[PDB]
């Protein structure tokens, strides 16, 4: 008969049939290593989900004593871009590296990410960081806002659902980062302010979740998360990348809500 894995795959297929485009997902149990997904090895544009790996790259340098979290970085008028909830309030002044990391994580602050990039070697350095932690697929090539560009076959600034789930697991739960850095990165994801209508909207209030969103404003909506169902021995990693959707922005968010509802209903 139809099993729970079948029902999960069918739900993700139905969501994709409704949105148009491609929906890539990966659910990874960090306790057992069990994994299931849709289009999990296909390339998707990251949009702001790259900021998770950028903050991790910054913390890796902190772990080696090569960067100070308290280093003050000047914020200049020429650094400004559209969505800058923290940095736009500090033009002409400065913010610490830790404050920029927080801003790019929890508010998706675009100038904050651009200001952190050179501290880890720019997009080539971020790609080297990813290879160094065992991610062979994800790649960073451009700064904001140009990194959002994507067309079928465009390789730049992409990940796969399964690679990003493994990278969540490595960075949040493995030993690529020192304990203080794993805790700090996890706390930023739990404090995210931009994902209330995405995966979080499909989970009960008692499930702890950290997440990082991305969007291009026209057809792509992504969300990547670490999720603790109450009482479970280990968290789940869940990646969801919706690209080329022909439904409107609210329907794109609601598609990610539905991805999480499927995990809630069938896996918890």
Handedness of CA 202, 206, 207, 212 (dihedral sign): positive
Q: Closest by alpha carbon to 8, among 21, 20, 23, 19? A: 23
What kind of experiment solved this structure?
A: X-ray
Please confirm whether the linkage preceding 145 is cis (ω < 30° from 0): yes
Superfamily for domain range 11-268: DD-peptidase/beta-lactamase superfamily (3.40.710.10)
Domain residue spans in the chain?
Answer: 11-268
Contacts of 19 by beta carbon, 8 Å cutoff, 6+ apart: 242, 245, 246, 247, 251, 252, 255
Resolution in A: 1.5
Catalytic residues: 48
């Amino acid at each position: 008969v139809v099993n729970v894995d079948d029902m999960l795959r069918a739900r993700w297929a139905e969501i994709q049939r409704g949105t148009g485009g491609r929906l890539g997902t990966c659910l990874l149990d960090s306790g057992s290593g069990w994994r299931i997904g849709q289009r999990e090895n296909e390339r998707f544009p990251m949009c702001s989900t790259f900021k998770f790996v950028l903050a991790a790259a910054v913390l890796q340098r902190v772990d080696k004593g090569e960067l100070r979290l308290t280093q003050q970085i000047k914020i200049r008028a020429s650094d400004m871009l559209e969505h800058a909830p923290v940095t736009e309030r500090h033009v002409g002044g400065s913010l610490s590296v830790a404050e920029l990391c927080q801003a790019t994580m929890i508010h998706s602050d675009n100038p904050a990410a651009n200001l952190l990039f050179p501290l880890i070697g720019d997009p080539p350095g971020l790609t080297r960081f990813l290879r160094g932690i065992g991610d062979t697929k994800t790649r960073s090539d451009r700064l904001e806002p140009a990194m959002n560009g994507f067309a079928p076959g465009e390789p730049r600034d992409t990940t796969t659902p399964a690679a990003m789930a493994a990278t969540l697991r490595t960075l949040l739960l493995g030993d690529a980062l020192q304990p203080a850095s794993r805790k700090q990165l996890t706390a930023w994801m739990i404090d995210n302010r931009t994902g209330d209508d995405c995966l979080r909207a499909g989970l009960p209030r008692d499930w702890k979740i950290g997440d990082k969103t991305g969007s291009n404003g026209t057809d792509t909506r992504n969300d990547i998360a670490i999720i603790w169902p109450p009482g479970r021995a280990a968290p789940l990693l869940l990646t969801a990348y919706l690209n080329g959707a022909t439904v409107d922005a609210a329907a794109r968010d609601a598609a990610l809500k539905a991805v999480a509802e499927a995990v809630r209903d069938l896996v918890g």
